[PDB]
Amino acid sequence: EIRQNEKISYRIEGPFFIIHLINPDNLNALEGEDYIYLGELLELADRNRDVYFTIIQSSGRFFSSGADFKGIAKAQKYPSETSKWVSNFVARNVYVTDAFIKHSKVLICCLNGPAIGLSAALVALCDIVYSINDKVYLLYPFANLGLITEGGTTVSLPLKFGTNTTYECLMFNKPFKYDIMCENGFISKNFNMPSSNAEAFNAKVLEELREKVKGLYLPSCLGMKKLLKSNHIDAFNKANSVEVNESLKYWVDGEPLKRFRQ
Amino acid sequence: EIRQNEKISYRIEGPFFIIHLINPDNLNALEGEDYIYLGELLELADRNRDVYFTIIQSSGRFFSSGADFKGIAKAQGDDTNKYPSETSKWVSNFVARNVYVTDAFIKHSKVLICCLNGPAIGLSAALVALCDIVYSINDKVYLLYPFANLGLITEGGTTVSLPLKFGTNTTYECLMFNKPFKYDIMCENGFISKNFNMPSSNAEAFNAKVLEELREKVKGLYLPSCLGMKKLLKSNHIDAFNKANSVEVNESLKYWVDGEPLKRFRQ
Amino acid sequence: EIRQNEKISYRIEGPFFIIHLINPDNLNALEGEDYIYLGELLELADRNRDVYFTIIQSSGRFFSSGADFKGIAKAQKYPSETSKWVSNFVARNVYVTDAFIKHSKVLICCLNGPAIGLSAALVALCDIVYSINDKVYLLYPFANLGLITEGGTTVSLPLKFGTNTTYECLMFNKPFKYDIMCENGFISKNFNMPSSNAEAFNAKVLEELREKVKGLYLPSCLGMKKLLKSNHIDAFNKANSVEVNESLKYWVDGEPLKRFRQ
Amino acid sequence: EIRQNEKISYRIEGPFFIIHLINPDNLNALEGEDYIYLGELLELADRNRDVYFTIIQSSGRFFSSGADFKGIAKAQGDDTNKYPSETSKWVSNFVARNVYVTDAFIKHSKVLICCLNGPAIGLSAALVALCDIVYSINDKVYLLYPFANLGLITEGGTTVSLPLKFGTNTTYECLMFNKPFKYDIMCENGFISKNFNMPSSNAEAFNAKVLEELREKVKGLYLPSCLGMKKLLKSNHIDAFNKANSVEVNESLKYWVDGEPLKRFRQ
Amino acid sequence: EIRQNEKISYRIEGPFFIIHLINPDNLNALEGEDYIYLGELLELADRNRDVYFTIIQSSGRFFSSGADFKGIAKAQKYPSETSKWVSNFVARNVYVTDAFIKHSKVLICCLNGPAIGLSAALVALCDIVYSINDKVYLLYPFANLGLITEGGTTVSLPLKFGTNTTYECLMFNKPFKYDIMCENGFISKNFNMPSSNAEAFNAKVLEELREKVKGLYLPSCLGMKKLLKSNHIDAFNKANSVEVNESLKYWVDGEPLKRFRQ
Amino acid sequence: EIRQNEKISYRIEGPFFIIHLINPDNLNALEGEDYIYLGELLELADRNRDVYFTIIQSSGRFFSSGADFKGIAKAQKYPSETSKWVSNFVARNVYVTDAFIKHSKVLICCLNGPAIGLSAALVALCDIVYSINDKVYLLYPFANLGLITEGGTTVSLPLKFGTNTTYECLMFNKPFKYDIMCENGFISKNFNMPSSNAEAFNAKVLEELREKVKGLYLPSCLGMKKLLKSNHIDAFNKANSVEVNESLKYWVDGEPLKRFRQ
Ligand SMILES: CCCCCCCC(=O)SCCNC(=O)CCNC(=O)[C@H](O)C(C)(C)COP(=O)(O)OP(=O)(O)OC[C@H]1O[C@@H](n2cnc3c(N)ncnc32)[C@H](O)[C@@H]1OP(=O)(O)O
Ligand SMILES: CCCCCCCC(=O)SCCNC(=O)CCNC(=O)[C@H](O)C(C)(C)COP(=O)(O)OP(=O)(O)OC[C@H]1O[C@@H](n2cnc3c(N)ncnc32)[C@H](O)[C@@H]1OP(=O)(O)O
């Protein structure tokens, strides 16, 4: 049981809890409350004993263009700038990043197009990623926005792409392109479908997943994930706290607001 | 430069940045915005190159009775809505404040000294346990962490600080059964570095006397060494504190959302 | 549901799962299968959603004199000495130590008299310890038996008694006496009752516990323990594996067997 | 000095301690006592001051098909009892063997080289992933960890070794869906240091050719440097491996005791 | 302010602190005091608030052939062999490795040819590496010199090249060649220029860097690096201390000196 | 085999390797080369298979007053201040601290009077400490000398005395007195003998040790220590490297030299 959100839906099909970003006209840009909603859906999936896999799917040509700048401008009532940003940015980010970090079900991202910023951080926290075609990329534009690492990217990017690649991309605001994703095994399967039909891609992933789970003992999947998660859980939780608190001086100084308004 | 707050003041005297909780009629109970203010003051002290020591002092017979329950009830009565869910409300009201103020203490680079003029409770007691040095007014001080009785869990880094400073077995006895860490336990674990043995009716005299002794003790010291040493000492547990901060604040949410603390905060 | 064991019983009273060592004529010395049984009882308590506290109580004048030497002599069928000790010692020790380390309920030991060896290791893994009187002590006689640290004592003893004290006691086979236990806050309450009535002591602890839990929100107790456990869980699990494997060369060399037979 | 085992032999040639799995008709499937024997051989090599490299070689078209299911069925049919409970049985049969052999690999101080003459499966594949260097016979080798299909979880340190050597996302795809780590994935992650590109019908020629190249490569090296370097490299993940060993072996128990793997091991 | 060194110069251009190894006739082999000098330059760059990037460039056909053996022979006054090597090797290595490990500016290496030994260790500690052409390699000849890992290679090589590749190269004294560097993303861009003009390569890298920093908020770069560094800082500091002390027995035994003399 | 040193002797008696500081007229103040010598003696004891305990004893009324200031003034040939202090301070500290941290034999300190500075740091690295009488203290005067923590005190002091006590003593240059030592179990036994006869104290400790080892299986002592050491070995090695490098800016700035001259 949870409120409805017009930008994000979910459903359950057998052992699969499927979350769908459904706002393609705005490239599935997300506001603060939408990130919170996403975290609440993960927590709902996590409490359902019939769910073994949580699948995140999107719509249109982008997975998500990241945080909604119009919503950010609306957040610019509180005794100080610090208090405002603690409520609007710190809170949201620590909550949703935490929901991904601790999630006990196998978390699969269907990457139907590019992801940017905090949405791309969340993709990097998923356990398995499938791409629609070779035009997908991840962009973390923090240096261009006057921000720093978010959503656990301090840990996930070096871990999944290597340290030297991560510095080149983050320091100079360059994308992690399809080729770098394939070379680091970030994408487990490219479906090579046209960008004009995310829907067909999403259905095809689900169809393959129904085939792949046949005969598996699903509690083994969760048992294995529980052990695998313990390799970096501490580093992720440490990073979440420091990222969110260290970002405050950037917001309070004002640079991101200037730049979020080109 | 910072706004004023009627419940907390500060001043600078030489190398000392002094923070004073000044609401003794309410036992220096603090609302969310006051915890935030406290974190902002630490960050202000941390940026001031003339400050080597940040001293936290209070007033009256309590250091602080903890989070203000009236303010907590305000975050439940509406007051428009103005939140799409209970989760969203508690993320903004509890998660955010706690993660911010705990972090300000954990990372503080100046020597952080607590003048314990009476008991401390809850999140305020957690902050006392994050200070580097603690002086007590007399042997009637105690720390109480009443999480089990409020339907909550560890806050303000107590997951790490209590076992570290009081031992694990003592921590379980106190936290599981809502029992205070009393003066004798504090002294036996070296938590209190000096008991001034003054009457509880004059926090003001105690506070002045601590400052007077501190002015004497710093004479002849090379103060950048103090900071250099703290910078190394902090690295022993910094990772564990930062990890605990994130986890404590997120794991509390289900307790707030379930509603138990609100029932219990009501008497 | 579990088999019966004549040396160890259990019962449930409200939120308390009570385990009772009931072989005072043999000072509650335990064989390998009894340590395993103890681990199985912990795991049973851990799965019961009505249990919040697991209380371990004993009988007579000793809590437990440790591993039963007669049973050890019986273990002296297997292709090698290594294989024998892997089955008899390694297996038992890793299993029972693990059951204590991961236990999610609040674990309380009623110390009715001295504990020795592996039984004393288990006492040091409990969250809270109450003593009957000031004659209790813990002895870890590994240096005298030709063995090394067991039951997580590599971590628990320095953690609960300090490093320098631990070296003095372990290197020279000296007890951790009541005074050192009180000074390190290892014992949370001394009941100051006569050693001739463990039964009255055990009942009195339970009576105080029923009083102390009134008004508490018990899920908070478990929530707090779950966070507290994460401080050292990794070090305990690492120690368990190394202790058990490093002990093998001592058993295979034969020294403990000579000495276990004075 | 050690007993003989008809399924595994060893010999020493100069600085090389060579272990050979010699039961190709059964795809070098191993029973519990064989895993133990393998650990004993590692410990023997580790104590020999003339040995600098421990080389593991196999026979036939498979490196090893993993744990022998017939032997597993023996540990279920009785065979007197002779165990007070299912838990006690599995502690002795599974827990004990796994924790011992995994530990022998994790702590081994000599350079550990695997000659991969064909596929490896299960616990045997876990041991391959614990070796320092791996050479393949041809591009048809693969590693399979079929835990999800057997109703089990990670074994032999794979909790740590697979994400470390293949990356996290690749590891989840393979483990969650019971898919092999194929040659191409092995090459792309640098898991295989050299592919010899020889036919699968002659493991013997492959094994000899690896040894021949190794005799050439060690010429002129100061061999104590190899060991000194390994001693430092091992410290990067030694704690994580030891922690994982204990947890893997204990967490598997509920899967054995519940019975699922026995049903599934039966076809 | 710092003394001059004829083998290494530096200059500052805008946000770039540029260090130039300028002894191509000796393949930029470095003596102990030159490594120390290099550490001092990093520490100077680190204290300059206008510097955001520290760029290390070399000359000729080699980046650096490593420690100068003629200088080593000079070091073979002190009460013991141990005391001599503590002063000559331990001290310098622990200092320069530490300067690279803690450096807070973005550290970029312009790899104009091969690097060997301690110089190659320093290349592996840089955040970003650009290569002149596909003939560059790194060689860590410790096994052939009778030494062990240096300059944090205990951590940096498995981290950046993987553990199995690291064992093959280190155990058998084999280079990490261009192909292995590209496959692990160690090199972020190959400029594909001729080895006869390091100068042109160096100028071209600086030109591209000036282009890539345009529009970026440079304090974000440093903020991000400060978080990224925390992933492995503890392991690097631990390794530094252990590498330098464990190498002593190799120097004192004398093997490296015999071998440094062929 | 090792050279002789007039300020420090050693001998072997059965399983005991006994190191004796023998310069009471100068309160056993030690120069750099004497610290190095002390490290070499530990490494000699560590390589001797008949040694199970390494015992450090001193003479006169002080254990050691710390680093010899006259020797420090001599050290104030080198291209820079940095290079000088790297050779004189960094090198020696990193070497001797490492020798104590890694030592595999049981390390016992006979505290015949106060210890100061780096010598007191070494006392805090010993496994077991016995005091002559209740007038012993440890003083770490770093704040008064314009230095920072040394000899692993960053880790050993909070570990053995607690964090709040450590801040009070270090920040304000106050001694850890006998009472604080006894309350934290730092001292395992006070012999309560007069300060005018260190020799009798030293002989009495050895006599009690010969009595306490009787019947023990000494390889168990070492086996246990090897496991106990792993609890904090990484933190000690990390601290060693950081302490020695971070102290440099204090020496180079000059403050300690001014203050070492009163
Ligand atoms: C509390 C949470 C804290 C948040 C942490 C902050 C960090 C982040 O999440 S990063 C978000 C920063 N966003 C960016 O940097 C913008 C980059 N995204 C882009 O899409 C690029 O502009 C670009 C060039 C790739 C898009 O090209 P293009 O496909 O032409 O986009 P466009 O056609 O304009 O998109 C369609 C519509 O979606 C809207 N839209 C797209 N992205 C966003 C966004 N991030 N925010 C708001 N609206 C957006 C457009 O305004 C446009 O509206 P309309 O149809 O009315 O013109
Ligand atoms: C964003 C932040 C999230 C943090 C979440 C939770 C963390 C916490 O801080 S937990 C702390 C919650 N507080 C408590 O459990 C205890 C608070 N209440 C108490 O009064 C003291 O504990 C107690 C009982 C020891 C005081 O004893 P006593 O000396 O008798 O004082 P008492 O007479 O009760 O109070 C004196 C006056 O101060 C007021 N006051 C004292 N503490 C508080 C408080 N915490 N909130 C509101 N008012 C308070 C009283 O209401 C009373 O006012 P009035 O004169 O109008 O009656």
Ligand SMILES: CCCCCCCC(=O)SCCNC(=O)CCNC(=O)[C@H](O)C(C)(C)COP(=O)(O)OP(=O)(O)OC[C@H]1O[C@@H](n2cnc3c(N)ncnc32)[C@H](O)[C@@H]1OP(=O)(O)O
């Ligand atoms: C698979 C698991 C691996 C096990 C890990 C191994 C490490 C350990 O657990 S340590 C166990 C080692 N045990 C010891 O060192 C023995 C020390 N225990 C003692 O009780 C001491 O002998 C001592 C002096 C304190 C007891 O004094 P006391 O009270 O006079 O004992 P006592 O009167 O003989 O005890 C009563 C009976 O219990 C029996 N008993 C007591 N302890 C044990 C024991 N550990 N094993 C077997 N039987 C025992 C006695 O044989 C005696 O039998 P009876 O009544 O027929 O004479």
Ligand SMILES: CCCCCCCC(=O)SCCNC(=O)CCNC(=O)[C@H](O)C(C)(C)COP(=O)(O)OP(=O)(O)OC[C@H]1O[C@@H](n2cnc3c(N)ncnc32)[C@H](O)[C@@H]1OP(=O)(O)O
């Ligand atoms: C204490 C230890 C605890 C460890 C617990 C679990 C960890 C594990 O090791 S899991 C591994 C379990 N094994 C498996 O899942 C796969 C084993 N079975 C297989 O045959 C191979 O995987 C497979 C299917 C790829 C082989 O393909 P293929 O080339 O067709 O060989 P196949 O014809 O099946 O077998 C050849 C012969 O060797 C025998 N054999 C092969 N592997 C095994 C085995 N693991 N156990 C018993 N017999 C085996 C076959 O029974 C067959 O004998 P026969 O001539 O009498 O029919």
